[PDB]
Paper text:
Here, the current status of the fully automated ambient-temperature beamline VMXi at Diamond Light Source is described, and a highly efficient pipeline from protein sample to final multi-crystal data analysis and structure determination is shown. The VMXi beamline and its associated PXF within the Research Complex at Harwell offer a highly automated pipeline where researchers provide a suitable protein sample that is used for robotic crystallization, monitoring and subsequent in situ data collection from crystals in crystallization plates or in thin-film sample delivery systems. Here we present illustrative examples of data measured using VMXi from a variety of proteins comprising both conventional crystallographic standards and ‘real world’ user samples. Routine RT data collection provides a useful capability that is highly relevant to studying protein dynamics and ligand binding without the complication of cryo-cooling.
Author numbering: -2 to 272
The structure:
């Protein structure tokens, strides 16, 4: 192009878009200052749109969940995994219940049978922490979504929306991203009288940065490495970096290898999300 190259950063829309606009707009400015290239945050309206925009080149660098990042990489030969938060290596879901539902804390996976007959909400259909891994753990206890009230699960579309519909009593129970839950409790965004945690899943890997191939052709030899180092270099030294790391609820970003997503890919194929 006679136009100078711009890096398009995206993220799955996993929470309130106002909070994501603040986070990714601050991050785009931080990456822009560290790389000396124009960086823009481009929002998408749902999880699949992030996969699709990445596959077709509408996004260059995307904050994906486990399932969406595995999908994006399988459909985009040469895409690479750059980084994840410290917390993404040992991620969990919380199962939450409205305190009028009569659900008690569960002490084992086998106790998930208590959710039979209950109005249950997942997050996005494509969510690792909000759908895929919760559905996986439910299946191990012998619970399938057909056994919920109405013969199916709700899909709220986001971790924030799962808290909202359980808190409101529209659903009795749901599952979501533990970091979003913990940040919501700490911020006063959830009424802990109305909503409580009844179970935490075992650990799995979840969020990661995925980058399109051939960025070095657009931005120059070494750019992809410099981009990775910029993410890995984020540190709570300036107000802007403190804000980014606060909103990610991370102390740092760390390297990650594609091979650590093999278990997520397997669950995705078992539950029919990956063809
Ligand atoms: Cl460009
Ligand atoms: Cl552009
Ligand atoms: Cl795929
Ligand atoms: Cl689905
Ligand atoms: Cl089912
Ligand atoms: Cl369902
Ligand atoms: Cl439903
Ligand atoms: Cl290249
Ligand atoms: Cl840097």
């Amino acid at each position: 192009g006679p136009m100078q190259p711009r890096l398009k950063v995206g993220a799955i829309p996993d929470q309130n878009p106002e909070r994501l606009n603040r986070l990714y707009g601050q991050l785009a400015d931080e990456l822009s200052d560290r790389l000396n290239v124009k960086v823009r945050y481009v929002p998408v309206s749902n999880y699949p749109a992030a996969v699709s925009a990445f596959r077709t080149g509408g996004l260059d660098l995307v904050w994906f969940g486990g399932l969406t990042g595995v999908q994006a990489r399988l459909q985009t030969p040469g895409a690479q995994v750059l980084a994840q938060r410290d917390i993404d290596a040992r991620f969990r879901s919380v199962f939450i219940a409205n305190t009028s539902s009569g659900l008690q804390p569960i002490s084992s996976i086998n106790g998930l049978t208590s959710l039979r007959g209950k109005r249950f909400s997942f997050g996005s259909e494509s969510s690792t922490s909000g759908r895929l891994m919760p559905q996986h753990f439910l299946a191990k206890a012998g619970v399938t979504p057909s056994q919920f009230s109405g013969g199916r699960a709700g899909f709220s579309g986001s971790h924030d929306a799962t808290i909202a519909v359980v808190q409101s009593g529209a659903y009795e129970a749901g599952a979501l991203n533990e970091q979003v839950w913990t940040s919501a409790v700490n911020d006063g965004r959830v009424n802990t009288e109305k909503v409580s945690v009844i179970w935490r899943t075992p650990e799995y890997v979840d969020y990661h940065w995925v980058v399109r191939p051939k960025l070095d052709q657009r931005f120059g030899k070494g750019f992809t490495t410099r981009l990775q180092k910029a993410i890995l270099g984020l540190e709570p030294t300036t107000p802007r970096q403190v804000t980014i790391l606060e909103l990610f609820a991370a102390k740092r970003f760390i390297p990650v290898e594609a091979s650590q997503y093999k278990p997520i890919e397997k669950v995705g194929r078992e539950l029919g999300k990956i063809r």
